[PDB]
Amino acid sequence: TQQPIVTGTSVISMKYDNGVIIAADNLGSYGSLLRFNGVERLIPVGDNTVVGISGDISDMQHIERLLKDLVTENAYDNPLADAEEALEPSYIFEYLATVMYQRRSKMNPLWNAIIVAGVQSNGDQFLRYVNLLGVTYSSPTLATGFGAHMANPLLRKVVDRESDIPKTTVQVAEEAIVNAMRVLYYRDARSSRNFSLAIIDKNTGLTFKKNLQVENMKWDFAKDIKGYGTQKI
């Protein structure tokens, strides 16, 4: 049993017709202090998977190393490591889920909430969540922390059920994700303007975008707001 120290906020994601999108800001908070501003919380595994992590950053760095070691280990005595016997998103997720549930069962959890986004061998989209309790679930949209409360409602307007996935394009899905990140910047006190976004497509592969910023923000209306009720000046 511990408590999280340096933390990362929301991770948001959604499925679209040819793949998945996942995003997360670049902040490492130390309570109310916005301590670290250059933290990457999306970690690619090969060219078909991206693991997005929230919660304790020290535990994230530990998971990051487990995944790096998983790639090394899979290549051992494996001539098809870059082909048929390469790591799949489902393999990577089940491994993490096994680790998370084992750690909670020893009362020494990895204080995280994880989303594994990727595309399988057969082109199927993969999107599943796992957390410090070993709890797992899948949905067309997935988000952690504040993203669950604010991002999912916006992303579910695009993909409300399974049948909406083929009707959703990558431009629409990316637009929705970027809008959601702006909303979280408006309303989450532990968020930052700077973020990373990753797209895993079954045709165009893995596109990893860094140093993105929230833009097109509305603040002008603030000038007209005066006092808290009766004040006019």
């Binding site: 309303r187 603040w219 707001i225 005066k226």
Partner: peptide, 8 residues
Amino acid sequence: YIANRVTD
């Protein structure tokens, strides 16, 4: 949660 982002 940011209850108000344009407080006076």
